[PDB]
Amino acid sequence: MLPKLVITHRVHEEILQLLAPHCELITNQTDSTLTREEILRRCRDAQAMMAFMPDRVDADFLQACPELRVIGCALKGFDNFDVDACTARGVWLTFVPDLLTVPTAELAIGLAVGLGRHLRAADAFVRSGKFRGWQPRFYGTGLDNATVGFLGMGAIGLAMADRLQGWGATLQYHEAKALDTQTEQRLGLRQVACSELFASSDFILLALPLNADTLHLVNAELLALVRPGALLVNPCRGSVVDEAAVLAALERGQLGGYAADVFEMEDWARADRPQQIDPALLAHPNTLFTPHIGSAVRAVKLEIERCAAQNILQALAGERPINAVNRLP
Amino acid sequence: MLPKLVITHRVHEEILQLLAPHCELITNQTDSTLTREEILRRCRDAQAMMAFMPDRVDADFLQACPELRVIGCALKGFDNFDVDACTARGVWLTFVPDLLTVPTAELAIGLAVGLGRHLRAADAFVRSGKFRGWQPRFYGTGLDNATVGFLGMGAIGLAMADRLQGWGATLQYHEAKALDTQTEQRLGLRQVACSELFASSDFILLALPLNADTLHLVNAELLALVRPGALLVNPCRGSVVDEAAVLAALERGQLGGYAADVFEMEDWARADRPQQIDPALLAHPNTLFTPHIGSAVRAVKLEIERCAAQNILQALAGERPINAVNRLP
Ligand SMILES: NC(=O)c1ccc[n+]([C@@H]2O[C@H](COP(=O)([O-])OP(=O)(O)OC[C@H]3O[C@@H](n4cnc5c(N)ncnc54)[C@H](O)[C@@H]3O)[C@@H](O)[C@H]2O)c1
Ligand SMILES: NC(=O)c1ccc[n+]([C@@H]2O[C@H](COP(=O)([O-])OP(=O)(O)OC[C@H]3O[C@@H](n4cnc5c(N)ncnc54)[C@H](O)[C@@H]3O)[C@@H](O)[C@H]2O)c1
């Protein structure tokens, strides 16, 4: 008789124990992600859903789950969940606004450094047993005296700026909403126009959501403006960049490197989503890739899961979930 | 007749044009490093030597070079130069106290983050073409909430601590000489003893020089104290650790990982150094290596050459050189 909650991926033992009194659990305690079908099947008369990165919820989905009251997302960017369609069908949609920030900021910064210093080739060369003593090659680019620019200055943007405080860089940024003047002053951050951002940054760090307006914002037009050698890092969504324009920009040698933790192929809500990452991109030596491990820190997963849990519980208790993304009664 | 100066490695054109007006230069504007035998032959009657990391200067070297008045080092770690022997024969020995610090500090943080997040493997996974989007695995270790222990707290250790300022980590160190109270509380650094450092740190960042006191300091004994999963980062000298001990600790699962820019094989002065990095260590998944690129940033390399050149010039003009390592009666 208790509400039914479908949890699409493994969560911690302790999280289940927190949910179990209040709802019956349709869980997936394995490593794999299940087909769309199998998940739709489970959700038919499900009253709650814990959704993770590979899930996409559209109107067709919601349509076949008439009893849903809350979809609790263990994530920040809800771009593959049609918020409106949720609101239309009376479904609460919740996110995790803070817990993913830091491990992701930490990673973005490591990518910057990894890319600026040719960490892949350097590591491969040492491993191939060919390294036999100090040599004047592998010249790299560090952050000291570099100008670093951010596209976006929300949670992840500020966590990055914070961590770059002691590093001797000129920090500058472009965003939709300006930062208050106190914060700018504190973090040594200068508000520039988007094209100046691309024209004058030695490192470009991406920190914005994927939505209608950001889709492919970082395109050939913007990449054309960059200092030869400029370094681009994408910790957020594959589709805010045009991967092909990024590839063309590396090939001509204008853009010095592209590191990324996210890919256009992950962005389900897009009708023309690439099925894979272009092999020519994987093959380009001036790159660095991680398979969406932005928040793949063990202690954090437990918290993220819990945040999503608590939200779900509140919804099912008839309260406004503390982290709803959308608005209802 | 102009004092004769032997440069053992390629230097920037600009550095030749500063030196040549004071000295007759015996240069090596090739890509190679030269034989000990060849360098001795050149130094037979030189009054100065500009030296780099492949150079090693013992008593027999000085004995074969009676005219030598200064050896100017394009580096910070003089472990391959016998200073007392230098002092004894009236030979200044200078070095470069700051130019190398920051690029090396940036690298070490990068290796820390890189190693913690399993970056080598992550990038392999993506590049293999079988990335199918996010998964509940690959999981790693962040700096937020971790304890980070430094062994050494001079130029480099401070730069690392500087660069960790906004990172949510508890910072500790053990040095041969304590930091002053102000710098301590400015950076949030607690002094602890060596063994306690290794027992209670999630990351251990090496930041000390190579000498008889520190040779093989990081040995089986010390490594047996670490929390399982602890991460070691060596950006200073290979031989401050026992690489076989490091390997064994990795192989038994106690040490979480090892990352280094330096290796026992490069430590020329060491009669018994291994001749290569152990293939079992290069094959170990829990590592990350860079081939001594600590200061491989072009803008900086020119500066390093300039620092040594000026030091060399001051000596020949009979001043005490600003960055002397010894002092002359
Ligand atoms: N790698 C990962 O695992 C991971 C983790 C967390 C978040 N992310 C992604 O990163 C995105 C942002 O993260 P956040 O926590 O900083 O989000 P946030 O909401 O805190 O910040 C979004 C920022 O981007 C700016 N922005 C929005 N639209 C813009 C536009 N058209 N032009 C310029 N700037 C614009 C906003 O003004 C805001 O500053 C998330 O939406 C998510 O998609 C990825
Ligand atoms: N990979 C590279 O390119 C690179 C670059 C610069 C320096 N290095 C190496 O790093 C070393 C240190 O660099 P630095 O600029 O910080 O030098 P530094 O002289 O400023 O710092 C040395 C620090 O180590 C501490 N120390 C010395 N003996 C110790 C012991 N027995 N136990 C604990 N602590 C001890 C000292 O007290 C001091 O704090 C250099 O000697 C050099 O060999 C490597």
User: Between A101-116 and A119-127, two packed helices, what is the crossing angle to 10 degrees?
Assistant: 70
What is the residue range of B65's domain?
1-97+295-329
Find out whether the beta carbon of B152 lies less than 6 Å from any atom of ligand 2. yes
Cα–Cα nearest to A140, from B301, B27, B268, B166:
B301
DSSP string, B164-187: TTTS-PEEEEE-SSPPPHHHHHHH
Q: Which amino acid is at A179?
A: L
B324's enclosing H/E stretch is: none
A329 and A256 in a common domain: no
- Distance, CA of A207 to CA of A289 (rounded, Å): 17
Tell me how many residue pairs between chain A and chain B have CB atoms under 8 A apart. Answer: 195
- Distance, CA of B279 to CA of A290 (rounded, Å): 26
Q: What SS3 class is residue B136?
A: coil
Alpha carbon A293 to chain centroid distance? 9
B197 and B77 in a common domain: no
A306 and A171 in a common domain: no
CA distance A129 to chain B (A): 7
Indicate if the alpha-carbon torsion angle B63, B68, B74, B78 is positive or negative. Answer: positive
Give Cα separations from A94 to A26, A39, A308, B113, B149 (angstroms): 19, 19, 7, 30, 39
- Distance, CA of A139 to CA of B294 (rounded, Å): 10
Residue with tokens 């940036």: B106
| The dihedral formed by the CA atoms of B252, B253, B257 and B258, expressed in degrees to the nearest 10 | -10
* PDB resolution in Å: 2.7
3-state secondary structure string, chain A? CCCEEEECCCCCHHHHHHHCCCCEEECCCCCCCCCHHHHHHHHCCCCEEEECCCCCECHHHHHHCCCCCEEEECCCCCCCECHHHHHHCCCEEECCCCCCHHHHHHHHHHHHHHHHCCHHHHHHHHHCCCCCCCCCCCCECCCCCCEEEEECCCHHHHHHHHHCHHHCCEEEEECCCCCCHHHHHHHCEEECCHHHHHHHCCEEEECCCCCCCCCCCECHHHHHCCCCCEEEEECCCHHHECHHHHHHHHHCCCEEEEEECCCHHHCCCCCCCCCCCCHHHHHCCCEEECCCCCCCEHHHHHHHHHHHHHHHHHHCCCCCCCCECCCCC
Rg value, chain B, Cα: 22
DSSP string, B59-106: HHHHHT-TT--EEEESSS--TTB-HHHHHHTT-EEE--SSTTHHHHHH
- Distance, CA of B197 to CA of A316 (rounded, Å): 48
B40's enclosing H/E stretch is: helix B36-43
- Contact between chains at A132 and B292 (C-beta distance less than 8 A): no
What order of strands is seen across the sheet that includes strand B170-174?
A: B189-191, B170-174, B147-151, B203-206, B230-234, B255-260, B287-289
Catalytic residue among A243, A264, A266, A305: A266
A311 and A279 in a common domain: no
- Distance, CA of A304 to CA of A78 (rounded, Å): 14
Give Cα separations from B211 to A216, B136, B174, B291 (angstroms): 55, 46, 17, 21
Q: Which amino acid is at A252?
A: R
- Contact between chains at B123 and A126 (C-beta distance less than 8 A): no
How many A from CA of A119 to the centre of ligand 2?
Answer: 23
B144 and B79 in a common domain: no
| The dihedral formed by the CA atoms of B123, A117, A156 and A144, expressed in degrees to the nearest 10 | 170
User: Between A119-127 and B119-127, two packed helices, what is the crossing angle to 10 degrees?
Assistant: 100
B241 and B152 in a common domain: yes
**Chain A residues whose beta carbon lies within 8 Å of the beta carbon of residue B297:** 139-142
User: Between A155-163 and A101-116, two packed helices, what is the crossing angle to 10 degrees?
Assistant: 50
B42's enclosing H/E stretch is: helix B36-43
B174 is catalytic: no
CB-defined site of ligand 1, < 6 Å: A 76-77, 100-101, 104, 151-157, 174-177, 207-210, 213-214, 235-237, 261-262, 292, 294-295
| CB-based burial label for B22 (10 Å; 0-12, 13-18, 19+) | middle
Q: What is the CATH number of the domain that holds A61?
A: 3.40.50.720
Long-range contacts of B270-279 (CB under 8 A, 24+ apart): B270/B215, B270/B239, B273/B239, B274/B243, B276/A129, B276/A132, B277/A126, B277/A129, B277/A131, B277/B243, B278/B243, B278/B244, B278/B247, B279/A129
Give the bridge partners for B25, in sequence order. B5
Name the token pair of B64. 């074969």
B266 near B238, Cβ under 8 Å?
A: yes
- Distance, CA of B258 to CA of B274 (rounded, Å): 18
Angle, alpha carbons B301-B42-B266 (nearest 5°): 50
Alpha carbon B53 to chain centroid distance? 10
B237 is catalytic: yes
DSSP string, B206-227: E----STTTTT-B-HHHHTTSP
Residue with tokens 């959700």: A43
User: What backbone phi and psi angles, to 5 degrees, belong to B289?
Assistant: -125, 145
B62 near B85, Cβ under 8 Å?
A: yes
- Distance, CA of A47 to CA of A45 (rounded, Å): 6
A165 and A136 in a common domain: yes
Q: Which amino acid is at A37?
A: E
Widest distance between CA atoms in chain B: 73
How many domains would you assign to chain B? 2
B290 and B188 in a common domain: yes
| B140 DSSP assignment | B
- Distance, CA of A22 to CA of B283 (rounded, Å): 49
Give Cα separations from A284 to A66, A240, A248, A324 (angstroms): 47, 20, 11, 41
A253 near A279, Cβ under 8 Å?
A: no
Widest distance between CA atoms in chain A: 72
- Distance, CA of A148 to CA of A173 (rounded, Å): 8
Cα–Cα nearest to A324, from A53, A81, A63, A17:
A81
A142 and A12 in a common domain: no
What order of strands is seen across the sheet that includes strand A48-51?
A: A24-26, A4-7, A48-51, A70-73, A92-94
B286 and B228 in a common domain: yes
**Chain A residues whose beta carbon lies within 8 Å of the beta carbon of residue B144:** 102-103, 106, 297
Residues comprising chain B, all counted: 329
B245 and B113 in a common domain: yes
Q: Which amino acid is at B155?
A: A
Indicate if the alpha-carbon torsion angle A164, A168, A169, A171 is positive or negative. Answer: positive
Residues sharing a CB contact under 8 Å with residue B66, sequence separation 6 or more, in sequence order: none
Long-range contacts of A212-221 (CB under 8 A, 24+ apart): A214/A239, A214/A240, A215/A239, A215/A240, A215/A270, A216/A240, A216/A241, A216/A242, A217/A151, A217/A241, A218/A151, A218/A242, A218/A245, A218/A246, A219/A245, A220/A245, A220/A248, A220/A249
Q: Which amino acid is at A271?
A: A
**Chain A residues whose beta carbon lies within 8 Å of the beta carbon of residue B33:** 133-134
Cα–Cα nearest to B229, from B279, B274, B286, B176:
B286
User: What backbone phi and psi angles, to 5 degrees, belong to A116?
Assistant: -60, -25
- Contact between chains at B297 and A139 (C-beta distance less than 8 A): yes
- Buried/exposed B55-64: b ≥16 CB within 10 Å, e otherwise: bbbeeebbee
Name the token pair of A97. 């606004």
B288 and B148 in a common domain: yes
Name the token pair of A16. 């289940």
